[PDB]
Design an enzyme around this catalytic site. Sequence first.
Site, PDB file in Angstrom:
ATOM      1  N   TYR A  72       4.695   4.838  -9.451  1.00  0.00           N
ATOM      2  CA  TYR A  72       5.965   4.155  -9.559  1.00  0.00           C
ATOM      3  C   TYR A  72       6.178   3.323 -10.745  1.00  0.00           C
ATOM      4  CZ  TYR A  72       6.394   4.755  -4.591  1.00  0.00           C
ATOM      5  OH  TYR A  72       6.420   5.499  -3.215  1.00  0.00           O
ATOM      6  N   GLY A  82       0.911   7.640  -5.695  1.00  0.00           N
ATOM      7  CA  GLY A  82       0.928   7.456  -4.347  1.00  0.00           C
ATOM      8  C   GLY A  82       2.059   7.564  -3.522  1.00  0.00           C
ATOM      9  N   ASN A  90       1.836   8.232   0.623  1.00  0.00           N
ATOM     10  CA  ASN A  90       2.205   7.022   1.239  1.00  0.00           C
ATOM     11  C   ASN A  90       3.209   7.216   2.543  1.00  0.00           C
ATOM     12  OD1 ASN A  90       4.965   6.704   0.340  1.00  0.00           O
ATOM     13  ND2 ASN A  90       3.951   5.240  -1.355  1.00  0.00           N
ATOM     14  N   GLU A 111       2.036  -3.653   9.817  1.00  0.00           N
ATOM     15  CA  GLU A 111       2.715  -2.315   9.979  1.00  0.00           C
ATOM     16  C   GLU A 111       2.182  -1.932  11.662  1.00  0.00           C
ATOM     17  OE1 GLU A 111       1.349   0.260   6.880  1.00  0.00           O
ATOM     18  OE2 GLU A 111       1.053   1.824   8.285  1.00  0.00           O
ATOM     19  N   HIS A 135      -3.673  -0.393  -0.851  1.00  0.00           N
ATOM     20  CA  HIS A 135      -2.704  -1.098  -1.414  1.00  0.00           C
ATOM     21  C   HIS A 135      -3.377  -2.110  -2.755  1.00  0.00           C
ATOM     22  CE1 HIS A 135      -0.245  -1.837   2.477  1.00  0.00           C
ATOM     23  NE2 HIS A 135      -0.159  -0.572   2.217  1.00  0.00           N
TER      24      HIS A 135
HETATM   25  C1  FAD Z   1      -2.375   6.095   2.590  1.00  0.00           C
HETATM   26  C2  FAD Z   1      -1.542   5.389   1.924  1.00  0.00           C
HETATM   27  C3  FAD Z   1      -0.089   4.606   2.632  1.00  0.00           C
HETATM   28  C4  FAD Z   1       0.504   3.585   1.787  1.00  0.00           C
HETATM   29  N1  FAD Z   1       1.741   3.416   2.587  1.00  0.00           N
HETATM   30  C5  FAD Z   1       2.247   2.668   1.661  1.00  0.00           C
HETATM   31  C6  FAD Z   1       3.922   2.567   2.039  1.00  0.00           C
HETATM   32  O1  FAD Z   1       4.504   2.541   3.115  1.00  0.00           O
HETATM   33  N2  FAD Z   1       4.504   1.546   1.454  1.00  0.00           N
HETATM   34  C7  FAD Z   1       4.255   0.824   0.300  1.00  0.00           C
HETATM   35  O2  FAD Z   1       4.978  -0.052  -0.311  1.00  0.00           O
HETATM   36  N3  FAD Z   1       3.012   1.197  -0.220  1.00  0.00           N
HETATM   37  C8  FAD Z   1       2.216   2.155   0.546  1.00  0.00           C
HETATM   38  N4  FAD Z   1       1.251   2.453  -0.110  1.00  0.00           N
HETATM   39  C9  FAD Z   1       0.804   1.909  -1.330  1.00  0.00           C
HETATM   40  C10 FAD Z   1       1.620   2.574  -2.562  1.00  0.00           C
HETATM   41  O3  FAD Z   1       1.458   4.051  -2.438  1.00  0.00           O
HETATM   42  C11 FAD Z   1       0.993   2.144  -4.028  1.00  0.00           C
HETATM   43  O4  FAD Z   1       0.958   0.674  -4.032  1.00  0.00           O
HETATM   44  C12 FAD Z   1       1.674   2.653  -5.124  1.00  0.00           C
HETATM   45  O5  FAD Z   1       1.503   4.053  -5.199  1.00  0.00           O
HETATM   46  C13 FAD Z   1       0.914   2.273  -6.480  1.00  0.00           C
HETATM   47  O6  FAD Z   1       1.850   2.594  -7.710  1.00  0.00           O
HETATM   48  P1  FAD Z   1       1.355   2.650  -8.891  1.00  0.00           P
HETATM   49  O7  FAD Z   1       2.353   2.842 -10.033  1.00  0.00           O
HETATM   50  O8  FAD Z   1       0.661   1.396  -9.350  1.00  0.00           O
HETATM   51  O9  FAD Z   1       0.151   3.804  -9.071  1.00  0.00           O
HETATM   52  P2  FAD Z   1       0.020   5.255  -8.288  1.00  0.00           P
HETATM   53  O10 FAD Z   1       1.050   5.449  -7.493  1.00  0.00           O
HETATM   54  O11 FAD Z   1      -1.414   5.118  -7.694  1.00  0.00           O
HETATM   55  O12 FAD Z   1       0.071   6.133  -9.345  1.00  0.00           O
HETATM   56  C14 FAD Z   1      -1.019   6.246 -10.457  1.00  0.00           C
HETATM   57  C15 FAD Z   1      -1.077   7.667 -11.049  1.00  0.00           C
HETATM   58  O13 FAD Z   1      -1.932   7.778 -12.293  1.00  0.00           O
HETATM   59  C16 FAD Z   1      -2.698   8.845 -12.099  1.00  0.00           C
HETATM   60  N5  FAD Z   1      -3.833   8.489 -12.855  1.00  0.00           N
HETATM   61  C17 FAD Z   1      -4.687   7.635 -12.739  1.00  0.00           C
HETATM   62  N6  FAD Z   1      -5.597   7.501 -13.899  1.00  0.00           N
HETATM   63  C18 FAD Z   1      -5.040   8.240 -14.835  1.00  0.00           C
HETATM   64  C19 FAD Z   1      -5.796   8.580 -16.073  1.00  0.00           C
HETATM   65  N7  FAD Z   1      -6.789   8.191 -16.506  1.00  0.00           N
HETATM   66  N8  FAD Z   1      -5.039   9.786 -16.671  1.00  0.00           N
HETATM   67  C20 FAD Z   1      -3.879  10.305 -16.253  1.00  0.00           C
HETATM   68  N9  FAD Z   1      -3.448   9.857 -14.697  1.00  0.00           N
HETATM   69  C21 FAD Z   1      -4.088   9.034 -14.238  1.00  0.00           C
HETATM   70  C22 FAD Z   1      -3.078   9.027 -10.771  1.00  0.00           C
HETATM   71  O14 FAD Z   1      -3.450  10.263 -10.525  1.00  0.00           O
HETATM   72  C23 FAD Z   1      -1.498   8.985  -9.969  1.00  0.00           C
HETATM   73  O15 FAD Z   1      -0.744   9.864  -9.881  1.00  0.00           O
HETATM   74  C24 FAD Z   1       0.314   3.546   0.383  1.00  0.00           C
HETATM   75  C25 FAD Z   1      -0.732   4.121  -0.070  1.00  0.00           C
HETATM   76  C26 FAD Z   1      -1.662   4.883   0.672  1.00  0.00           C
HETATM   77  C27 FAD Z   1      -3.049   5.458  -0.255  1.00  0.00           C
END
Ligand code: FAD
Length: 498
Positions: free
Chosen positions: A12, A107, A111, A353, A439
């Site tokens: 995100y 995620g 998610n 939830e 999360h």
């Molecule tokens: C089972 C599950 C259910 C969920 N349900 C919900 C929901 O319904 N609603 C909600 O609001 N949230 C939900 N979440 C939480 C939500 O998905 C996360 O809060 C959100 O995706 C976090 O966003 P972010 O941008 O911080 O990181 P992420 O979405 O985790 O993205 C990080 C990205 O960086 C990449 N990456 C990591 N390190 C490196 C590196 N060193 N080099 C290159 N790439 C790298 C990863 O592979 C990934 O693609 C859920 C999560 C899970 C796992």
Amino acid sequence: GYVPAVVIGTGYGAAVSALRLGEAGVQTLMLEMGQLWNQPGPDGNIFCGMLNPDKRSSWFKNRTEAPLGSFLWLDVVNRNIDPYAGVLDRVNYDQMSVYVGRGVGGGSLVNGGMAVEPKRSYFEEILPRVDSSEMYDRYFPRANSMLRVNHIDTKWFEDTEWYKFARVSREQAGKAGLGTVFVPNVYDFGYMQREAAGEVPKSALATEVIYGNNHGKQSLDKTYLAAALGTGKVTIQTLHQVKTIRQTKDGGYALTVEQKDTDGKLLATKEISCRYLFLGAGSLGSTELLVRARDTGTLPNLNSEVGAGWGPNGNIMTARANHMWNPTGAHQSSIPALGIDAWDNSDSSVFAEIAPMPAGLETWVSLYLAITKNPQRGTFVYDAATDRAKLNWTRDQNAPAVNAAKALFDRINKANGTIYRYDLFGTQLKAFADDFCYHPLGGCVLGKATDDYGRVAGYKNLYVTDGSLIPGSVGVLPFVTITALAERNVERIIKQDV
Ligand SMILES: Cc1cc2nc3c(=O)[nH]c(=O)nc-3n(C[C@H](O)[C@H](O)[C@H](O)COP(=O)(O)OP(=O)(O)OC[C@H]3O[C@@H](n4cnc5c(N)ncnc54)[C@H](O)[C@@H]3O)c2cc1C
């Protein structure tokens, strides 16, 4: 080689950042360690379902695992697999397992799609340096529109077998004086109706979510990332993991980046440099990069707040045994639609939830993912021996979260004469799962490790964009907050810095 801006990750924070950079005319490269999920696998689908997990389900594990809560019914479908660049990574720390997506979209691939704004009064509590008016007036609306948030049809919800599970918990909760709310989603509820009618291929209604959705779910590849690519100024390289970050003598940044195949074999290491560096590797990934950089001397001026302030959004999972007369159904949509809103910003707050279960036969179980207000925080500590940032969180630190969840659900049990399940989370009697996290929040907290827009303290043109910014808790499902914060931050950064 060189590129003006680099974004690490494609979740995100990253996706928002890259879209706005591209719209501003800044050539941007996104580096994603996982796959672009667009190739049909051996069943003709991109993603495996929860009843047919295979190597696509798992980031470099040798056996599939059942969805938390479901072991008693889904262990029968587990199988040995070859370690592979699959979509869901269970990251094991000493007393906490954090689950994260791996792939283009992060995620958003795995998610539940639930798109919830935090309570404004709670936002103001957790981030008092942030102007909340602009958040609620401008950036939250901007995020919901661009994420393609939509709302379930209440008549359909009320009538469909696929949401009986939700209506049962609604009815049980109401007897304890507790209310439910509809939770908006990025899964297309119109599509979901057509699934139920047999009109389109099923996804939510075919036990898919946590290993991806083959249909219906508007993950970030479809929304922000598609738009970013559409600017003509953004490219995405996959199976590229950033390992190290350094500043260059003239104040840009240089990365060491490993390119692997889907079996994990190292194909190349490369050096990539940039003027502007945006971290969107998630709470775990961004924090690990910065802790490593500080403690190995490549970003020596990072502050002591890098690594600190992590929490699991108060996550606790629990389950109740329904009366026989209250079956939850063999057909349960994989996308939650209702929550129990018992969040008043006090220490007893719970937003829970109402979670579907994938078993596909009647079990009488109601499952819940509680979000609680627990002040305990963990710290990521670099281990130079293994080159890993270790999360120092201990199970006892979740006691306040367990206590809040248990108080809530004890009210529901008393009002209904029901008991907990004790057998869903291992052999030992355990009603509350207290050592997982869906999360993860914090590690590079906004205003602590960074300024109030995610500029990393000690450095110019170095930004953190993602869940690592959040101070351990938002009181709701987090991705809308991450998205809206990222919209705020990147807009300012582009105006003042770029
Ligand atoms: C089972 C599950 C259910 C969920 N349900 C919900 C929901 O319904 N609603 C909600 O609001 N949230 C939900 N979440 C939480 C939500 O998905 C996360 O809060 C959100 O995706 C976090 O966003 P972010 O941008 O911080 O990181 P992420 O979405 O985790 O993205 C990080 C990205 O960086 C990449 N990456 C990591 N390190 C490196 C590196 N060193 N080099 C290159 N790439 C790298 C990863 O592979 C990934 O693609 C859920 C999560 C899970 C796992």
